[PDB]
Design an enzyme around this catalytic site. Structure first.
Site, PDB file in Angstrom:
ATOM      1  N   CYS A   1     -88.709   6.136 -37.192  1.00 32.28           N
ATOM      2  CA  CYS A   1     -87.874   7.092 -36.577  1.00 32.28           C
ATOM      3  C   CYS A   1     -87.219   7.733 -37.991  1.00 32.28           C
ATOM      4  CB  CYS A   1     -86.742   6.410 -35.704  1.00 32.28           C
ATOM      5  SG  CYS A   1     -87.699   5.843 -34.200  1.00 32.28           S
TER       6      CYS A   1
ATOM      7  N   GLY B   1     -90.063   1.671 -37.176  1.00 32.69           N
ATOM      8  CA  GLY B   1     -89.660   2.095 -38.483  1.00 32.69           C
ATOM      9  C   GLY B   1     -89.874   3.729 -38.786  1.00 32.69           C
TER      10      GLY B   1
ATOM     11  N   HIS C   1     -79.242   6.325 -33.674  1.00 32.23           N
ATOM     12  CA  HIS C   1     -79.593   4.974 -33.201  1.00 32.23           C
ATOM     13  C   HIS C   1     -79.691   4.116 -34.717  1.00 32.23           C
ATOM     14  CE1 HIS C   1     -84.008   6.265 -33.197  1.00 32.23           C
ATOM     15  NE2 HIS C   1     -83.870   5.035 -33.914  1.00 32.23           N
TER      16      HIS C   1
END
Lengths: 301, 5, 301, 5
Positions: free
Chosen positions: A145, A143, A41
């Protein structure tokens, strides 16, 4: 003595954390040899997030659409591919700090350390269990991920988790390092919910053994039980059934303490039925279930 | 809502 | 979201851990620049341990009585000195992995990460608070002495603790990196006991704010209290008095949540008087006191 | 007893 929720030393993983930016989206990646792993993503914008077609978004990108930053340095991306929910960016430089490592897909009830990271920089380290419903109760902000979870055995890092999302209940979902989600979750901002969770019974028992090893014994009794009667009680309290495999895994701890597994099950049964009545075990007023038997053996030695 | 991190 | 007992990433400290052997005694040391710091009881044998005269034991040693091992390599010791309860071994090589670092002596109620180490090899990392009675509730076995505790600020490591001993209650005692014990303890195997401990009130309040930040709100009320009436209740429950300094330190959290400090004190007061009645806060059934306000701000951001 | 680690 003492018993703490202990994480693995994180330096070998710290050496591997990088920043990946695509367009306006920045998250963390894992740099091993000449490949950077990150959540796919990263190729999304905020309004692609309700129902992205990742294949479409990715066919519209080239190598130079991706910026990888390793501390000071920029790494040139020379290839890119998608594997399930992770992106693999082939870079022109092998990570000189690459540890001995494996990728592992863990079973529910197993524990691991998470290195929480933001913009490629480690923030903190903590221990987690994969819940029976395949979420983890983590600590993650925007942030984070691409932050990973891992175990270390001798000096080989077994990576088992990469962080992708937070469910409405405040719990967390992610993938193995091949990009397969734990649980039924998908990487889109749709209505998703964790299944009903249960308590990891074998882990509770292991922690009661840790308590005994460390001198907390007020909860023992002279009683015993059969596996089946114990499991009747466990079902009643939303505990996972105890298998003979679990009983055997508890062998060494039972042997070090001289408390038969089913005797400790009788103690757990009366703890479930009576509560603690104002007392604590290893500094907890709840029955803790995020220590595996192997965690207990490792820390208590 | 799921929320991607 | 989520709230975990989070340690600092430990790699910068891992780079500094070495093994120190004197005679038959082996423990851990901290290698910074060209100096190795370790507990002085490395110059003890087991029957020197009831009442050693360390000056006598040390005047009878020379540089070549000490072996320092840094992973593979042996480091040649070229000087040695004693500072309070620590030994300083000057070695012929500066640690190439030396981080930016400071030595700090912390106040009770402050938290830090411990890197548990055996034979110079990190075992695990966990978060601790210095208790009001100047012990820590750690997890330490034989061979762990010389393991250190630290905070990291930006990329500077502030070392604040080196581990020396375990008291009969299962709690732990040690020094700053200049070798001064926290608390009244001495490094001999004599009858010593921790003073009566108390609960770190400002930290409990900070953690209640963390709970609110993360959506645990069942414990709030419409009441308030004065600092003095709250402190009357706190004294009754063996909590530390709350100072206006503490109230001010809680300023930013109060401001982010919109809950006045004394309103949260009223909530704590009714939590102390009523208990939890089967409910939990941030997954704990006890009031947690090993998060400082700065820990809460750091992790919740 | 204190116990040195």
């Amino acid at each position: 003595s003492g018993f703490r929720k202990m994480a693995f030393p994180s330096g070998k993983v710290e050496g591997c954390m990088v920043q990946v930016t695509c367009g306006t989206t920045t998250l963390n990646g894992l740099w091993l040899d000449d490949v950077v792993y990150c959540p796919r993503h990263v190729i999304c914008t905020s309004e692609d997030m309700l129902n992205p077609n990742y294949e479409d978004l990715l066919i519209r990108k080239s190598n130079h659409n991706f910026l990888v930053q390793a501390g000071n340095v920029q790494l040139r991306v020379i290839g890119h591919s998608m594997q399930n929910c992770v992106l693999k960016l082939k870079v022109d430089t092998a990570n000189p700090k690459t540890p001995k490592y494996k990728f592992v897909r863990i079973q529910p009830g197993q524990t691991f350390s998470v290195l929480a990271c933001y913009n490629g920089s480690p923030s903190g380290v903590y221990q987690c269990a994969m819940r029976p419903n395949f979420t983890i109760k983590g600590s993650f902000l925007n942030g984070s991920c691409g932050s990973v979870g891992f175990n270390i055995d001798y000096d080989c890092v077994s990576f088992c988790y990469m962080h992708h999302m937070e469910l409405p209940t405040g719990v967390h979902a992610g993938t193995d390092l091949e990009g397969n989600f734990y649980g039924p979750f998908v990487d889109r901002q749709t209505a998703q919910a964790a299944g009903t969770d249960t308590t990891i019974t074998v882990n509770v028992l292991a922690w009661l053994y840790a308590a005994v090893i460390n001198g907390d014994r007020w909860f023992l009794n002279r009683f015993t039980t059969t596996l089946n009667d114990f499991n009747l009680v466990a079902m009643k309290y939303n505990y996972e059934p105890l298998t003979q495999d679990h009983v055997d895994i508890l062998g060494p701890l039972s042997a070090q303490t001289g408390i038969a597994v089913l005797d400790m099950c009788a103690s757990l049964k009366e703890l479930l039925q009576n509560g603690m009545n104002g007392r604590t075990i290893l500094g907890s007023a709840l029955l803790e279930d995020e220590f595996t038997p192997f965690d207990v053996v490792r820390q208590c030695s | 809502x799921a929320v991607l991190x």
